[PDB]
Structures are given as structure tokens and as C-alpha cells.
Ligand binder design. Structure first.
Ligand SMILES: CC(C)c1csc(CNC(=O)c2cc[nH]n2)n1
Ligand SMILES: [Zn+2]
Ligand SMILES: [Zn+2]
Ligand SMILES: [Zn+2]
Length: 419
């Protein structure tokens, strides 16, 4: 993003009466009192969604962030207020991103307030590790990343993007409320910071969707994905054996493969891309014969003859960022904005109970280890390994936020007779 690019300044002219209409980033960064550019492109901002922090200042000044926090600088002086800012950003971001990106609906005070807690300079490395530096300390003249900035007092080489440069009509609230009933406006700065990030997420991940953008590994992404594949195979295989459906309607990703390739059933696929905005309406999508597989295909009310994996947007993890209108932004290799978890979607179904099933040839005691050996008295070591490993994946998947649901007649008692 060129510093000589033009910045629309009408949103600033109430806090800053008389501001030039003709303004570049180079002049604005100078006017703000100051790594080619503090400001970044929409594309760069999308690539670093994990770093977004909504930021609003309202005027003695009230700083509010999309973490829900409101600080008053004068009410306490800036020299302590900037300590809090580094601490809050480091604890929010250290497990999410190598930077911060302040998302703004800029009117003026937020930009003029930056010089009181931001230092910039050449790109630097953490004094105590190899990550890029995000903080500076004036007491030691040293730099640190988000993990090692305890005590540091300045944010260093932050990034930022002004949503009001994207060509909106009207003010923040009226634009946010068009898409979002979850965030109100209590007339506190942090409410504006939250609405600003909500709108930005709506524009970049709900209205728009770029599934080519890859995102770095920051946790159990790979173990979770592998667990999900394992559980899916297990659960669909068992449902076909227990109830012997003649046909399975696999509704969802257009690049899906048979997850139980050796099953005897007629496998029919139906293409439906991950819905980002509102959950699909089962009436438009449509199935009464056999069983329907909705593996991460969020609909408003599943049919009764379904197997269902549905991500729960409320889960607290580093992979799941707060989203728009109650949805959440699940970033695991790719970004998937997900509509809000709604329990009523599952009224025709029941929670799927845990169970491990195997027909593979052959100290654990478990009613849920469905195998020949356990049928005959005592679980062999192999199936005791496989069982304890499957339990681990299952628990990983659940804890990652996924939830499983099945037709009410599903009964693991029916699997014992396949031995
Ligand atoms: C006590 C300090 C000095 C202070 C400054 S502004 C404020 C209240 N904030 C708002 O009215 C507001 C407007 C938009 N979003 N929030 N309190
Ligand atoms: Zn470090
Ligand atoms: Zn919102
Ligand atoms: Zn066995």
C-alpha cells in the first residue's frame, strides 16, 4: 500500500476542522506525528485477520478496543495507559498473530492519539526470541514480541486500516446494524471498536469470501482436521452397519469424497458451499429415503434421517475469532465465517453418543469399545490402543467446537451383531 495513495478525509473533518481534502498517507502519517506504511491494504488486512483489534477513541479521552475494554487517558495519565495497552494486546494476540492491525472508523482522535502509545522504526526482532518485535520498552531500550513484552510500555510498528476508506454511506452504526443485531451501541468507545471490527469482518468474510488465502498454523489445526476425518469415517460407517440405509445423500462441500469408500450404499452427492451469512434453508436445498449427511453443512432445521457435524460458534479457542451477527470466524488453514449456533436446528435429532467401533482383526474396560474381543469378554491390546487414540481425536474435535447429532433411532446396540 503506497504511502502516496490518497486518503479520504471527510470523516476526520469534525475532530480536525479544516483538514485538507487532498491528502496522502505520507502527509497523514506525518500529521499523526511520525515497514513501508503504517496503513495496509484490504488484501493485507484479510491475510492478517487474526491480528485485528477494533480501536475507537471518543472525546480527556476514552480509548475503546474490540476486546471490550475502555481506558480513560487524561482517568489516568498516558504513561500508565500505554502500559495497559501493551499488556492487553500481548495477552490477546500472542497466541494468534505476529502483529496487530488496528481497525478503525476514523474520525480523528484515534489517529492523533497513536503517538502517545506507538513507536515505529525498522523491522526488529524480539530481544528474547526470533519473532518480529511488536513492543518497545523505554526503560531498557529493548524490543519484544507479544510473548515477552511483560513490562514494556510502547506498541511498535503496528498496522492499521480505516474502514471508512472503503466507500460507505452514512455512519458506523447504521452500516453495522444492517447486518448485525448482536452488538448494540451503549455509547462507549469499545462499542464502536466492536462494531467497526464486526463490519470489517462482514465485508471481508461474509459478503466476500477468498478461500485461496492460506493462514499459518498456530495450534492444533492439523490434529483437529485429522480427528474430524477419523470421526466422520467412524460415525458414518457405524450408521450404515446399524441401520443399513440403501442410499446416503451427502450434502455439502462440492469436493467431498466418500468417507466410507467400502460401504455398500448408494452414495449421492449434492454441492453446497460453506454458507457464510445465514444458515441454508432446508426447503431451498431440497431425501426422505436412506440417510442425509450434513458434514459441516449448516442448515436451519435438519431432517430427521440425518447424520450431522455442526460447528458451535460459541467455542472459546485461538482458532475461532468473534464474527458478525452472532457467527464466528473459524480460521484453520482457511477462513470460514460460520453462522451462529442455533440449538433448534437439531430438534428432529439427538446428541450423538461417543462410541468406538471396529471390525478389524484383533487393560481397557469400556462399554463403548465395540469390538469382537470386548464382545467375547476382554479387549485385546490393539483395539485398546485404537480405542484410546480414537477417544483422543474425538475429544480434540469436540473441544475444538464441533458437535455431532444423529437420527433418534441410532443405537450402538445394533453394531454388536455385525460380529
Ligand atoms: C470520561 C471520558 C473523558 C469520556 C470521553 S467520551 C466518553 C463517553 N463515550 C461516548 O459517549 C461514545 C461515543 C461514541 N462511542 N462512545 N467518556
Ligand atoms: Zn519474543
Ligand atoms: Zn456486530
Ligand atoms: Zn480386539
Amino acid at each position: 500500500l503506497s504511502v502516496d495513495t490518497k486518503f479520504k478525509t471527510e470523516g476526520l473533518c469534525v475532530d480536525i476542522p479544516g483538514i485538507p481534502k487532498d491528502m496522502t498517507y505520507r502527509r497523514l502519517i506525518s500529521m499523526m506525528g511520525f515497514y513501508p506504511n503504517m496503513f495496509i491494504t484490504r488484501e493485507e488486512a484479510i491475510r492478517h485477520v487474526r491480528a485485528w483489534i477494533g480501536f475507537d477513541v471518543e472525546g480527556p479521552l476514552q480509548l475503546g478496543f474490540s476486546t471490550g475494554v475502555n481506558l480513560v487517558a487524561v482517568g489516568l495519565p498516558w504513561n500508565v495507559v500505554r502500559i495497559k495497552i501493551v499488556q492487553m494486546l500481548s495477552d490477546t494476540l500472542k497466541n494468534l498473530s505476529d502483529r496487530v492491525v488496528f481497525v478503525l472508523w476514523a474520525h480523528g482522535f484515534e489517529l492523533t492519539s497513536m503517538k502517545y502509545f506507538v513507536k515505529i522504526g525498522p523491522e526488529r526482532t524480539c530481544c528474547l526470541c526470533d519473532r518480529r518485535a511488536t513492543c518497545f520498552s523505554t526503560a531498557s531500550d529493548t524490543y519484544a514480541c507479544w510473548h515477552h513484552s511483560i513490562g514494556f510500555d510502547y506498541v511498535y510498528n503496528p498496522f492499521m486500516i480505516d474502514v471508512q476508506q472503503w466507500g460507505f454511506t452514512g455512519n458506523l452504526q447504521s452500516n453495522h446494524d444492517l447486518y448485525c443485531q448482536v452488538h448494540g451501541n451503549a455509547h462507549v468507545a469499545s462499542c464502536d471498536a466492536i462494531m467497526t471490527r464486526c463490519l470489517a469482518v462482514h465485508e471481508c468474510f461474509v459478503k466476500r469470501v477468498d478461500w485461496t488465502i492460506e493462514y499459518p498454523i498456530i495450534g492444533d489445526e492439523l490434529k483437529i482436521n485429522a480427528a474430524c476425518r477419523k470421526v466422520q469415517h467412524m460415525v458414518v460407517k457405524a450408521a450404515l452397519l446399524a441401520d443399513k440405509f440403501p442410499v446416503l445423500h451427502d450434502i455439502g462441500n462440492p469436493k467431498a469424497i466418500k468417507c466410507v469408500p467400502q460401504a455398500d450404499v448408494e452414495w449421492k452427492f449434492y454441492d453446497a458451499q460453506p454458507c457464510s451469512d445465514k444458515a441454508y434453508k432446508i426447503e431451498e436445498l431440497f431425501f426422505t429415503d436412506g440417510v442425509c449427511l450434513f458434514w459441516n453443512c449448516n442448515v436451519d432445521r435438519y431432517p430427521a434421517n440425518s447424520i450431522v457435524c455442526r460447528f458451535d460458534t460459541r467455542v472459546l479457542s485461538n482458532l475461532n475469532l468473534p464474527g458478525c451477527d452472532g457467527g464466528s470466524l473459524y480460521v484453520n488453514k482457511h477462513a470460514f465465517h460460520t453462522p451462529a449456533f442455533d440449538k433448534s436446528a437439531f430438534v428432529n435429532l439427538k446428541q450423538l453418543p461417543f462410541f468406538y467401533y471396529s471390525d478389524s482383526p484383533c487393560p481397557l474396560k469400556s462399554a463403548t469399545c465395540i469390538t469382537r474381543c470386548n464382545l467375547g469378554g476382554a479387549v485385546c491390546r490393539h483395539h485398546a490402543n485404537e480405542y484410546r487414540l480414537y477417544l483422543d481425536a474425538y475429544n480434540m474435535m469436540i473441544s475444538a467446537g464441533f458437535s455431532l447429532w444423529v437420527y433418534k433411532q441410532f443405537d450402538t446396540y445394533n453394531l454388536w451383531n455385525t460380529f
